Nucleic acid binder design. Structure first.
Lengths: 50, 100, 100, 99, 161
DNA sequence: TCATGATCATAGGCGGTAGCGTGCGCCAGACAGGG
DNA sequence: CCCTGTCTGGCGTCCTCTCACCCCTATGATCATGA
Protein backbone atom coordinates (compact mmCIF):
# COMPACT_ATOMS: atom_id res chain seq x y z
CA UNK A 1 0.00 0.00 0.00
CA UNK A 2 1.20 3.56 -0.64
CA UNK A 3 0.72 6.03 2.18
CA UNK A 4 0.93 9.03 -0.23
CA UNK A 5 4.26 10.25 1.16
CA UNK A 6 6.79 8.78 -1.24
CA UNK A 7 7.26 5.66 0.90
CA UNK A 8 5.66 2.22 1.27
CA UNK A 9 4.82 1.08 4.78
CA UNK A 10 4.92 -2.54 3.72
CA UNK A 11 2.74 -5.38 4.86
CA UNK A 12 4.25 -7.86 7.27
CA UNK A 13 4.30 -10.74 4.79
CA UNK A 14 6.74 -9.12 2.38
CA UNK A 15 9.03 -8.44 5.33
CA UNK A 16 8.88 -12.11 6.36
CA UNK A 17 9.48 -13.44 2.83
CA UNK A 18 12.29 -10.93 2.40
CA UNK A 19 13.94 -12.22 5.57
CA UNK A 20 13.67 -15.84 4.41
CA UNK A 21 15.13 -15.01 1.00
CA UNK A 22 18.01 -12.98 2.51
CA UNK A 23 18.91 -15.80 4.89
CA UNK A 24 18.52 -18.48 2.21
CA UNK A 25 20.72 -16.67 -0.31
CA UNK A 26 23.40 -16.20 2.33
CA UNK A 27 23.16 -19.90 3.15
CA UNK A 28 23.52 -20.86 -0.52
CA UNK A 29 26.62 -18.67 -0.74
CA UNK A 30 28.05 -20.17 2.45
CA UNK A 31 27.47 -23.72 1.21
CA UNK A 32 29.05 -22.65 -2.08
CA UNK A 33 32.42 -21.36 -0.87
CA UNK A 34 32.73 -24.20 1.74
CA UNK A 35 31.58 -24.05 5.42
CA UNK A 36 34.37 -23.92 8.11
CA UNK A 37 33.91 -27.55 9.37
CA UNK A 38 31.65 -27.29 12.49
CA UNK A 39 30.24 -24.00 11.05
CA UNK A 40 27.53 -24.80 8.42
CA UNK A 41 25.04 -24.91 11.34
CA UNK A 42 24.38 -21.41 12.70
CA UNK A 43 23.09 -20.29 9.31
CA UNK A 44 20.69 -23.23 9.05
CA UNK A 45 19.47 -22.47 12.57
CA UNK A 46 18.77 -18.90 11.46
CA UNK A 47 16.91 -20.13 8.36
CA UNK A 48 14.79 -22.55 10.40
CA UNK A 49 13.92 -19.77 12.82
CA UNK A 50 13.02 -17.39 9.97
CA UNK B 1 8.02 -45.84 -54.81
CA UNK B 2 8.00 -48.68 -52.31
CA UNK B 3 8.41 -48.42 -48.56
CA UNK B 4 11.51 -50.59 -48.82
CA UNK B 5 13.23 -48.19 -51.19
CA UNK B 6 12.50 -45.28 -48.88
CA UNK B 7 13.95 -47.26 -46.00
CA UNK B 8 17.07 -48.13 -47.97
CA UNK B 9 17.59 -44.48 -48.74
CA UNK B 10 17.07 -43.41 -45.16
CA UNK B 11 19.69 -45.92 -44.19
CA UNK B 12 22.08 -44.63 -46.83
CA UNK B 13 21.54 -41.08 -45.58
CA UNK B 14 22.24 -42.14 -42.03
CA UNK B 15 25.46 -43.77 -43.12
CA UNK B 16 26.57 -40.72 -45.05
CA UNK B 17 25.90 -38.69 -41.92
CA UNK B 18 27.93 -41.09 -39.83
CA UNK B 19 31.10 -41.54 -41.86
CA UNK B 20 31.52 -38.07 -43.32
CA UNK B 21 34.54 -36.97 -41.29
CA UNK B 22 36.53 -40.16 -41.83
CA UNK B 23 35.73 -40.48 -45.53
CA UNK B 24 36.62 -36.83 -46.13
CA UNK B 25 39.89 -37.24 -44.24
CA UNK B 26 40.74 -40.29 -46.33
CA UNK B 27 39.97 -38.44 -49.56
CA UNK B 28 42.23 -35.61 -48.42
CA UNK B 29 45.04 -38.02 -47.64
CA UNK B 30 44.72 -39.68 -51.03
CA UNK B 31 44.76 -36.32 -52.80
CA UNK B 32 47.69 -34.91 -50.86
CA UNK B 33 50.62 -34.93 -53.27
CA UNK B 34 53.01 -34.06 -50.42
CA UNK B 35 52.61 -37.44 -48.78
CA UNK B 36 54.10 -40.94 -48.62
CA UNK B 37 53.20 -43.55 -51.23
CA UNK B 38 52.50 -46.30 -48.70
CA UNK B 39 50.28 -43.94 -46.73
CA UNK B 40 48.32 -43.15 -49.89
CA UNK B 41 47.88 -46.86 -50.56
CA UNK B 42 46.71 -47.46 -47.02
CA UNK B 43 44.22 -44.66 -47.46
CA UNK B 44 42.73 -46.04 -50.67
CA UNK B 45 42.48 -49.52 -49.15
CA UNK B 46 40.88 -48.03 -46.05
CA UNK B 47 38.34 -46.27 -48.27
CA UNK B 48 37.56 -49.64 -49.78
CA UNK B 49 36.97 -51.07 -46.30
CA UNK B 50 34.35 -48.50 -45.34
CA UNK B 51 30.75 -49.29 -46.29
CA UNK B 52 29.53 -48.42 -49.73
CA UNK B 53 26.33 -46.75 -48.48
CA UNK B 54 28.64 -44.32 -46.71
CA UNK B 55 29.20 -42.56 -50.02
CA UNK B 56 27.05 -39.52 -50.73
CA UNK B 57 27.14 -40.35 -54.43
CA UNK B 58 25.04 -43.43 -53.68
CA UNK B 59 21.96 -41.64 -52.38
CA UNK B 60 19.24 -40.71 -54.83
CA UNK B 61 17.06 -37.66 -54.23
CA UNK B 62 13.40 -38.67 -53.99
CA UNK B 63 10.16 -36.92 -53.39
CA UNK B 64 9.74 -36.39 -49.69
CA UNK B 65 6.07 -37.35 -50.01
CA UNK B 66 5.95 -40.15 -52.58
CA UNK B 67 9.58 -41.20 -52.89
CA UNK B 68 9.47 -40.89 -56.66
CA UNK B 69 13.08 -40.86 -57.92
CA UNK B 70 12.54 -39.07 -61.23
CA UNK B 71 11.09 -35.64 -61.91
CA UNK B 72 12.66 -34.29 -58.73
CA UNK B 73 13.25 -30.68 -57.72
CA UNK B 74 15.74 -29.57 -55.08
CA UNK B 75 14.25 -26.30 -53.84
CA UNK B 76 11.03 -28.07 -52.87
CA UNK B 77 12.20 -31.60 -52.18
CA UNK B 78 9.25 -32.84 -54.21
CA UNK B 79 8.59 -34.52 -57.50
CA UNK B 80 7.06 -32.46 -60.28
CA UNK B 81 3.61 -33.93 -59.75
CA UNK B 82 3.38 -33.14 -56.06
CA UNK B 83 5.00 -29.76 -56.60
CA UNK B 84 2.31 -28.84 -59.10
CA UNK B 85 -0.32 -29.96 -56.65
CA UNK B 86 1.33 -27.68 -54.10
CA UNK B 87 1.35 -24.67 -56.39
CA UNK B 88 -2.32 -25.20 -57.18
CA UNK B 89 -3.37 -25.71 -53.58
CA UNK B 90 -1.48 -22.63 -52.38
CA UNK B 91 0.96 -24.32 -50.02
CA UNK B 92 4.17 -23.36 -51.75
CA UNK B 93 4.70 -19.69 -50.82
CA UNK B 94 5.36 -17.19 -53.58
CA UNK B 95 4.92 -19.73 -56.35
CA UNK B 96 2.40 -18.91 -59.07
CA UNK B 97 1.94 -19.59 -62.75
CA UNK B 98 4.38 -17.53 -64.78
CA UNK B 99 3.88 -15.88 -68.16
CA UNK B 100 6.04 -13.46 -70.13
CA UNK C 1 12.62 -6.18 -10.10
CA UNK C 2 13.30 -9.49 -11.84
CA UNK C 3 12.81 -11.80 -10.26
CA UNK C 4 12.13 -10.74 -6.69
CA UNK C 5 8.93 -10.95 -4.69
CA UNK C 6 6.82 -8.73 -6.89
CA UNK C 7 7.75 -9.99 -10.33
CA UNK C 8 6.47 -9.88 -13.87
CA UNK C 9 7.91 -12.99 -15.51
CA UNK C 10 6.92 -15.16 -12.55
CA UNK C 11 3.51 -13.76 -11.73
CA UNK C 12 2.29 -11.86 -14.78
CA UNK C 13 1.79 -8.35 -16.13
CA UNK C 14 0.86 -5.42 -13.93
CA UNK C 15 -1.50 -3.97 -16.56
CA UNK C 16 -3.99 -5.91 -18.69
CA UNK C 17 -2.65 -6.99 -22.11
CA UNK C 18 0.03 -4.36 -21.27
CA UNK C 19 3.33 -6.28 -21.83
CA UNK C 20 6.23 -4.95 -19.66
CA UNK C 21 8.36 -4.39 -22.83
CA UNK C 22 5.24 -3.53 -24.90
CA UNK C 23 4.89 -5.12 -28.39
CA UNK C 24 1.41 -6.78 -28.45
CA UNK C 25 -1.83 -4.71 -28.16
CA UNK C 26 -4.10 -5.95 -31.02
CA UNK C 27 -7.60 -7.56 -30.75
CA UNK C 28 -6.63 -10.01 -33.56
CA UNK C 29 -3.26 -10.71 -31.82
CA UNK C 30 -4.06 -12.55 -28.53
CA UNK C 31 -2.35 -15.72 -27.19
CA UNK C 32 1.26 -14.97 -28.30
CA UNK C 33 3.68 -14.27 -25.37
CA UNK C 34 6.35 -11.50 -25.25
CA UNK C 35 10.03 -12.12 -26.23
CA UNK C 36 11.81 -9.10 -24.64
CA UNK C 37 10.52 -9.47 -21.02
CA UNK C 38 8.84 -12.81 -21.90
CA UNK C 39 5.55 -11.65 -20.26
CA UNK C 40 2.45 -13.44 -21.70
CA UNK C 41 0.23 -10.43 -22.64
CA UNK C 42 -2.90 -11.61 -20.72
CA UNK C 43 -4.84 -10.14 -17.78
CA UNK C 44 -3.72 -8.79 -14.42
CA UNK C 45 -6.21 -11.03 -12.58
CA UNK C 46 -3.62 -13.76 -13.11
CA UNK C 47 -1.41 -11.96 -10.59
CA UNK C 48 -4.03 -13.00 -8.04
CA UNK C 49 -3.62 -16.74 -8.74
CA UNK C 50 -0.06 -17.51 -9.87
CA UNK C 51 2.19 -18.78 -7.11
CA UNK C 52 5.96 -19.04 -6.94
CA UNK C 53 8.27 -21.29 -5.00
CA UNK C 54 11.48 -20.93 -3.01
CA UNK C 55 14.03 -23.73 -3.13
CA UNK C 56 15.38 -23.94 0.40
CA UNK C 57 19.09 -24.69 0.42
CA UNK C 58 18.65 -27.02 3.38
CA UNK C 59 15.43 -28.73 4.51
CA UNK C 60 13.32 -27.10 7.17
CA UNK C 61 10.88 -28.35 9.77
CA UNK C 62 7.33 -27.09 9.54
CA UNK C 63 6.21 -25.53 12.80
CA UNK C 64 2.60 -26.73 12.77
CA UNK C 65 3.63 -30.37 13.00
CA UNK C 66 6.39 -29.68 15.53
CA UNK C 67 4.72 -27.48 18.15
CA UNK C 68 0.95 -27.85 17.99
CA UNK C 69 0.56 -29.76 21.35
CA UNK C 70 0.37 -32.70 20.60
CA UNK C 71 3.35 -32.94 18.27
CA UNK C 72 2.61 -35.06 15.22
CA UNK C 73 6.32 -35.51 14.52
CA UNK C 74 6.51 -36.18 18.26
CA UNK C 75 4.09 -39.09 18.56
CA UNK C 76 4.93 -40.31 15.07
CA UNK C 77 8.61 -40.99 15.84
CA UNK C 78 7.84 -42.20 19.40
CA UNK C 79 10.07 -39.44 20.69
CA UNK C 80 9.38 -36.60 23.15
CA UNK C 81 9.23 -33.01 21.96
CA UNK C 82 12.29 -31.79 23.88
CA UNK C 83 14.67 -34.11 22.02
CA UNK C 84 13.15 -33.07 18.69
CA UNK C 85 13.55 -29.39 19.54
CA UNK C 86 17.14 -29.96 20.61
CA UNK C 87 17.85 -31.72 17.31
CA UNK C 88 16.01 -29.31 15.00
CA UNK C 89 17.82 -26.22 16.30
CA UNK C 90 21.35 -27.60 15.80
CA UNK C 91 22.41 -28.11 19.40
CA UNK C 92 22.50 -31.91 19.73
CA UNK C 93 22.90 -35.09 17.68
CA UNK C 94 20.34 -37.76 16.93
CA UNK C 95 21.32 -41.16 15.57
CA UNK C 96 20.40 -42.51 12.15
CA UNK C 97 21.67 -45.93 10.97
CA UNK C 98 23.37 -46.82 14.23
CA UNK C 99 24.98 -50.00 12.94
CA UNK C 100 26.41 -52.88 14.96
CA UNK D 1 26.01 2.83 -41.18
CA UNK D 2 23.22 0.28 -41.01
CA UNK D 3 22.31 -1.42 -44.25
CA UNK D 4 19.02 -3.32 -44.11
CA UNK D 5 18.06 -5.92 -46.67
CA UNK D 6 14.35 -6.76 -46.83
CA UNK D 7 13.43 -9.86 -48.81
CA UNK D 8 9.98 -11.21 -49.52
CA UNK D 9 7.81 -12.98 -52.05
CA UNK D 10 4.90 -10.53 -51.80
CA UNK D 11 5.77 -7.05 -53.04
CA UNK D 12 2.95 -5.18 -51.32
CA UNK D 13 3.98 -6.84 -48.06
CA UNK D 14 7.63 -5.97 -48.52
CA UNK D 15 6.64 -2.39 -49.35
CA UNK D 16 4.62 -2.21 -46.14
CA UNK D 17 7.60 -3.55 -44.22
CA UNK D 18 9.90 -1.01 -45.84
CA UNK D 19 7.61 1.80 -44.88
CA UNK D 20 7.27 0.64 -41.28
CA UNK D 21 11.02 0.29 -40.75
CA UNK D 22 11.51 3.74 -42.24
CA UNK D 23 9.08 5.20 -39.69
CA UNK D 24 10.80 3.39 -36.86
CA UNK D 25 14.08 4.89 -38.01
CA UNK D 26 12.88 8.41 -38.61
CA UNK D 27 11.23 9.08 -35.28
CA UNK D 28 14.23 8.09 -33.17
CA UNK D 29 17.20 9.03 -35.33
CA UNK D 30 17.81 11.30 -38.27
CA UNK D 31 18.78 11.12 -41.95
CA UNK D 32 17.36 7.82 -43.06
CA UNK D 33 19.03 7.05 -46.37
CA UNK D 34 16.04 5.63 -48.24
CA UNK D 35 14.15 2.58 -49.55
CA UNK D 36 16.15 1.65 -52.65
CA UNK D 37 14.63 -1.14 -54.81
CA UNK D 38 17.17 -3.71 -55.93
CA UNK D 39 16.49 -6.17 -58.74
CA UNK D 40 13.92 -8.90 -58.21
CA UNK D 41 14.91 -12.54 -58.51
CA UNK D 42 12.43 -14.37 -60.79
CA UNK D 43 13.28 -18.01 -60.19
CA UNK D 44 11.38 -19.98 -62.78
CA UNK D 45 10.52 -23.66 -62.91
CA UNK D 46 9.13 -25.90 -65.63
CA UNK D 47 7.40 -29.17 -64.88
CA UNK D 48 5.53 -31.87 -66.69
CA UNK D 49 1.93 -31.81 -65.55
CA UNK D 50 0.96 -35.24 -66.85
CA UNK D 51 1.24 -38.08 -64.35
CA UNK D 52 2.84 -40.41 -66.89
CA UNK D 53 3.65 -39.06 -70.36
CA UNK D 54 2.81 -35.89 -72.20
CA UNK D 55 6.01 -33.93 -72.61
CA UNK D 56 4.72 -30.80 -74.33
CA UNK D 57 2.14 -30.59 -71.54
CA UNK D 58 3.87 -28.34 -69.05
CA UNK D 59 3.42 -25.72 -66.41
CA UNK D 60 5.86 -22.91 -65.75
CA UNK D 61 5.84 -21.43 -62.26
CA UNK D 62 8.01 -18.81 -60.71
CA UNK D 63 8.85 -17.19 -57.43
CA UNK D 64 9.49 -13.44 -57.40
CA UNK D 65 11.85 -12.62 -54.55
CA UNK D 66 11.78 -8.88 -53.98
CA UNK D 67 14.64 -6.91 -52.48
CA UNK D 68 14.50 -3.61 -50.63
CA UNK D 69 17.67 -1.90 -49.47
CA UNK D 70 17.05 0.55 -46.63
CA UNK D 71 19.92 2.40 -45.09
CA UNK D 72 20.50 4.34 -41.90
CA UNK D 73 23.36 6.78 -41.93
CA UNK D 74 23.52 7.81 -38.25
CA UNK D 75 23.07 5.00 -35.72
CA UNK D 76 22.07 6.65 -32.43
CA UNK D 77 21.46 5.04 -29.05
CA UNK D 78 17.67 5.07 -29.31
CA UNK D 79 17.30 4.18 -32.96
CA UNK D 80 19.22 0.92 -33.32
CA UNK D 81 17.62 -0.18 -30.08
CA UNK D 82 14.12 0.42 -31.26
CA UNK D 83 14.37 -2.31 -33.98
CA UNK D 84 15.00 -5.12 -31.35
CA UNK D 85 11.33 -4.89 -30.05
CA UNK D 86 9.84 -3.77 -33.43
CA UNK D 87 9.41 -7.03 -35.28
CA UNK D 88 8.02 -6.87 -38.79
CA UNK D 89 5.21 -8.65 -40.53
CA UNK D 90 5.81 -12.29 -41.33
CA UNK D 91 6.95 -13.59 -44.68
CA UNK D 92 9.50 -10.77 -44.79
CA UNK D 93 13.11 -11.73 -44.11
CA UNK D 94 15.00 -8.65 -42.98
CA UNK D 95 18.78 -8.47 -42.72
CA UNK D 96 20.38 -5.62 -40.82
CA UNK D 97 24.13 -5.01 -40.96
CA UNK D 98 25.98 -2.12 -39.34
CA UNK D 99 29.09 -1.16 -41.27
CA UNK E 1 41.55 -18.14 27.00
CA UNK E 2 41.52 -19.90 23.66
CA UNK E 3 40.37 -19.97 20.03
CA UNK E 4 36.62 -19.68 19.64
CA UNK E 5 34.46 -19.07 16.59
CA UNK E 6 31.89 -16.34 17.14
CA UNK E 7 29.28 -14.77 14.92
CA UNK E 8 30.59 -11.22 15.05
CA UNK E 9 30.41 -7.99 13.14
CA UNK E 10 32.37 -6.73 10.19
CA UNK E 11 35.20 -4.62 8.89
CA UNK E 12 36.40 -3.12 12.18
CA UNK E 13 38.56 -5.92 13.55
CA UNK E 14 41.32 -3.86 15.08
CA UNK E 15 39.26 -2.36 17.91
CA UNK E 16 37.49 -5.32 19.53
CA UNK E 17 40.72 -6.98 18.51
CA UNK E 18 42.44 -4.13 20.30
CA UNK E 19 40.75 -5.56 23.37
CA UNK E 20 41.96 -8.87 22.01
CA UNK E 21 45.39 -8.48 20.32
CA UNK E 22 46.26 -6.30 23.24
CA UNK E 23 46.92 -9.88 24.32
CA UNK E 24 48.34 -12.67 22.14
CA UNK E 25 44.73 -13.16 21.01
CA UNK E 26 44.06 -15.21 17.89
CA UNK E 27 41.64 -14.39 15.08
CA UNK E 28 40.79 -15.93 11.75
CA UNK E 29 38.16 -16.12 9.01
CA UNK E 30 37.96 -17.65 5.52
CA UNK E 31 39.50 -15.56 2.78
CA UNK E 32 38.64 -14.31 -0.72
CA UNK E 33 39.68 -11.61 -3.14
CA UNK E 34 36.97 -9.37 -4.65
CA UNK E 35 37.25 -7.69 -8.04
CA UNK E 36 34.08 -5.63 -8.04
CA UNK E 37 33.34 -2.77 -10.40
CA UNK E 38 31.81 -0.76 -7.59
CA UNK E 39 30.74 2.38 -9.45
CA UNK E 40 32.47 2.43 -12.83
CA UNK E 41 35.67 1.18 -11.18
CA UNK E 42 37.16 -2.29 -10.79
CA UNK E 43 38.19 -2.59 -7.12
CA UNK E 44 40.37 -5.39 -5.72
CA UNK E 45 39.97 -6.32 -2.03
CA UNK E 46 41.18 -9.61 -0.55
CA UNK E 47 38.74 -9.55 2.35
CA UNK E 48 37.59 -12.43 4.56
CA UNK E 49 35.35 -14.86 2.70
CA UNK E 50 32.70 -15.22 5.36
CA UNK E 51 30.16 -12.99 6.99
CA UNK E 52 30.43 -12.49 10.72
CA UNK E 53 32.08 -15.88 11.51
CA UNK E 54 35.40 -15.05 13.19
CA UNK E 55 37.93 -16.83 15.45
CA UNK E 56 38.81 -14.90 18.65
CA UNK E 57 40.92 -16.03 21.64
CA UNK E 58 39.61 -15.02 25.02
CA UNK E 59 38.74 -16.30 28.50
CA UNK E 60 35.16 -16.57 29.73
CA UNK E 61 34.62 -16.24 33.45
CA UNK E 62 36.70 -13.53 35.13
CA UNK E 63 36.06 -11.16 32.21
CA UNK E 64 32.28 -11.21 31.92
CA UNK E 65 30.77 -10.53 28.52
CA UNK E 66 28.24 -7.74 29.14
CA UNK E 67 31.14 -5.43 30.02
CA UNK E 68 32.72 -6.16 26.63
CA UNK E 69 29.33 -6.07 24.87
CA UNK E 70 29.57 -2.40 23.84
CA UNK E 71 31.82 -3.33 20.90
CA UNK E 72 31.50 -5.25 17.63
CA UNK E 73 32.59 -8.82 17.14
CA UNK E 74 29.40 -9.81 18.94
CA UNK E 75 26.48 -11.63 17.42
CA UNK E 76 26.95 -14.77 19.54
CA UNK E 77 28.99 -17.96 20.05
CA UNK E 78 28.85 -21.05 17.89
CA UNK E 79 26.40 -23.03 19.96
CA UNK E 80 24.57 -26.05 18.47
CA UNK E 81 23.10 -25.92 21.96
CA UNK E 82 22.54 -23.63 24.91
CA UNK E 83 26.17 -23.44 26.00
CA UNK E 84 28.81 -21.55 24.02
CA UNK E 85 30.27 -24.51 22.14
CA UNK E 86 34.01 -25.09 22.31
CA UNK E 87 34.88 -24.78 18.64
CA UNK E 88 37.56 -26.66 16.72
CA UNK E 89 40.22 -24.62 14.92
CA UNK E 90 40.45 -27.04 11.95
CA UNK E 91 41.96 -24.37 9.70
CA UNK E 92 44.50 -23.40 12.36
CA UNK E 93 45.48 -26.97 13.16
CA UNK E 94 45.17 -29.05 9.98
CA UNK E 95 43.83 -26.68 7.27
CA UNK E 96 46.01 -23.53 7.26
CA UNK E 97 46.20 -22.18 3.70
CA UNK E 98 43.22 -22.39 1.32
CA UNK E 99 40.62 -20.79 -1.06
CA UNK E 100 41.55 -22.62 -4.28
CA UNK E 101 37.80 -22.88 -4.94
CA UNK E 102 37.99 -19.75 -7.08
CA UNK E 103 38.10 -15.96 -6.76
CA UNK E 104 34.66 -16.03 -8.46
CA UNK E 105 34.09 -12.71 -6.59
CA UNK E 106 30.64 -14.22 -5.83
CA UNK E 107 28.22 -13.30 -8.70
CA UNK E 108 30.27 -10.44 -10.07
CA UNK E 109 31.30 -11.00 -13.67
CA UNK E 110 34.48 -12.13 -15.39
CA UNK E 111 35.03 -12.13 -19.18
CA UNK E 112 32.32 -13.82 -21.23
CA UNK E 113 29.55 -13.56 -18.56
CA UNK E 114 25.87 -13.99 -19.61
CA UNK E 115 23.75 -11.19 -17.99
CA UNK E 116 21.99 -7.85 -18.82
CA UNK E 117 23.91 -5.80 -21.46
CA UNK E 118 21.58 -2.76 -21.94
CA UNK E 119 18.92 -0.77 -19.97
CA UNK E 120 16.87 2.40 -20.69
CA UNK E 121 15.06 1.43 -23.93
CA UNK E 122 16.93 -1.59 -25.43
CA UNK E 123 17.25 -3.97 -22.42
CA UNK E 124 14.10 -6.17 -22.23
CA UNK E 125 16.49 -8.91 -23.47
CA UNK E 126 19.59 -10.50 -21.90
CA UNK E 127 22.04 -9.52 -24.69
CA UNK E 128 25.57 -10.69 -23.97
CA UNK E 129 28.92 -9.51 -22.88
CA UNK E 130 30.63 -11.83 -25.31
CA UNK E 131 33.54 -10.02 -23.70
CA UNK E 132 33.72 -7.34 -21.05
CA UNK E 133 36.69 -6.09 -23.02
CA UNK E 134 36.90 -2.81 -21.12
CA UNK E 135 34.00 -1.36 -19.33
CA UNK E 136 33.91 1.57 -21.86
CA UNK E 137 31.82 1.16 -25.07
CA UNK E 138 30.92 -0.79 -28.30
CA UNK E 139 27.73 -1.73 -30.29
CA UNK E 140 25.65 -4.25 -28.30
CA UNK E 141 25.91 -7.87 -28.15
CA UNK E 142 22.66 -7.63 -30.15
CA UNK E 143 21.19 -10.42 -32.36
CA UNK E 144 18.20 -9.85 -34.73
CA UNK E 145 18.29 -11.05 -38.40
CA UNK E 146 21.97 -10.25 -39.22
CA UNK E 147 25.41 -10.48 -37.50
CA UNK E 148 25.66 -10.65 -33.65
CA UNK E 149 27.46 -7.37 -32.71
CA UNK E 150 29.02 -6.89 -29.23
CA UNK E 151 28.27 -4.30 -26.60
CA UNK E 152 26.49 -0.96 -27.37
CA UNK E 153 27.42 0.82 -24.36
CA UNK E 154 29.63 3.14 -22.34
CA UNK E 155 31.65 2.74 -19.11
CA UNK E 156 29.13 2.45 -16.28
CA UNK E 157 26.64 0.92 -18.59
CA UNK E 158 27.34 -2.42 -20.10
CA UNK E 159 26.06 -4.53 -17.10
CA UNK E 160 23.30 -2.62 -15.23
CA UNK E 161 23.11 0.78 -17.04
C1' DT F 1 46.18 24.20 -8.30
C1' DC F 2 45.49 21.56 -4.28
C1' DA F 3 43.57 20.65 0.10
C1' DT F 4 40.20 21.08 3.58
C1' DG F 5 35.72 21.92 5.27
C1' DA F 6 30.87 22.10 4.92
C1' DT F 7 26.55 20.78 3.11
C1' DC F 8 23.46 17.72 0.94
C1' DA F 9 21.82 13.32 -0.34
C1' DT F 10 21.29 8.51 0.19
C1' DA F 11 21.13 4.37 2.74
C1' DG F 12 19.07 -0.27 7.20
C1' DG F 13 16.36 -3.52 11.89
C1' DC F 14 16.85 -4.10 21.08
C1' DG F 15 21.70 -0.48 21.63
C1' DG F 16 25.14 -1.73 24.00
C1' DT F 17 31.00 -2.56 25.76
C1' DA F 18 23.44 -4.24 29.93
C1' DG F 19 18.85 -4.68 30.54
C1' DC F 20 14.66 -3.80 29.41
C1' DG F 21 9.88 -7.29 31.38
C1' DT F 22 6.33 -6.47 36.74
C1' DG F 23 -1.90 -4.46 37.14
C1' DC F 24 -5.84 -10.96 33.91
C1' DG F 25 -8.03 -15.10 34.43
C1' DC F 26 -10.15 -19.78 33.61
C1' DC F 27 -9.96 -24.25 31.70
C1' DA F 28 -7.61 -28.10 29.96
C1' DG F 29 -4.59 -31.39 28.58
C1' DA F 30 0.05 -32.92 28.16
C1' DC F 31 4.65 -33.20 30.40
C1' DA F 32 6.89 -34.35 34.18
C1' DG F 33 8.01 -34.63 39.82
C1' DG F 34 7.50 -37.47 43.88
C1' DG F 35 6.83 -41.52 45.73
C1' DC G 1 3.31 -46.61 37.15
C1' DC G 2 0.15 -43.76 39.71
C1' DC G 3 -0.95 -39.73 41.23
C1' DT G 4 -0.17 -34.51 41.46
C1' DG G 5 1.91 -30.36 40.33
C1' DT G 6 3.48 -27.29 36.62
C1' DC G 7 3.35 -25.43 32.13
C1' DT G 8 1.82 -23.46 28.17
C1' DG G 9 -1.57 -23.38 25.00
C1' DG G 10 -6.38 -21.69 23.88
C1' DC G 11 -10.21 -18.21 24.65
C1' DG G 12 -12.37 -13.35 26.42
C1' DT G 13 -19.66 -8.83 22.25
C1' DC G 14 -21.47 -6.22 17.90
C1' DC G 15 -21.92 -2.14 14.72
C1' DT G 16 -20.51 2.72 13.73
C1' DC G 17 -17.91 7.51 14.12
C1' DT G 18 -13.72 10.70 14.93
C1' DC G 19 -8.46 11.84 15.35
C1' DA G 20 -3.05 11.22 14.87
C1' DC G 21 0.84 8.35 13.08
C1' DC G 22 3.51 5.68 9.31
C1' DC G 23 12.25 6.84 10.00
C1' DC G 24 15.95 10.21 11.56
C1' DT G 25 20.89 9.78 11.92
C1' DA G 26 25.30 8.93 10.06
C1' DT G 27 28.54 8.59 6.44
C1' DG G 28 30.33 9.64 2.04
C1' DA G 29 30.94 12.45 -1.88
C1' DT G 30 31.10 16.69 -4.26
C1' DC G 31 31.70 21.50 -4.60
C1' DA G 32 33.47 25.81 -3.19
C1' DT G 33 36.69 28.72 -1.00
C1' DG G 34 41.09 29.88 0.72
C1' DA G 35 45.94 29.61 0.89
Amino acid sequence: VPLDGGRFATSDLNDLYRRVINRNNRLKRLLDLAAPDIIVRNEKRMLQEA
Amino acid sequence: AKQSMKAREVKRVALADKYFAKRAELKAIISDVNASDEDRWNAVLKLQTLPRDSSPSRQRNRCRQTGRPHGFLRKFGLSRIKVREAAMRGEIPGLKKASW
Amino acid sequence: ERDGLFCARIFGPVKDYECLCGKYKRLKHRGVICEKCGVEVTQTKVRRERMGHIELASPTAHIWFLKSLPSRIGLLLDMPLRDIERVLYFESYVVIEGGM
Amino acid sequence: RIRIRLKAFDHRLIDQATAEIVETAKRTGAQVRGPIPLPTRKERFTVLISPHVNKDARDQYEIRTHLRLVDIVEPTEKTVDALMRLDLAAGVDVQISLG
Amino acid sequence: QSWYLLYCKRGQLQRAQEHLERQAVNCLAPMITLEKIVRGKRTAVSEPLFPNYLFVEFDPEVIHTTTINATRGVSHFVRFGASPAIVPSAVIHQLSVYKPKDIVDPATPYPGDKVIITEGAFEGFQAIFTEPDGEARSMLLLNLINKEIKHSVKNTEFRKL
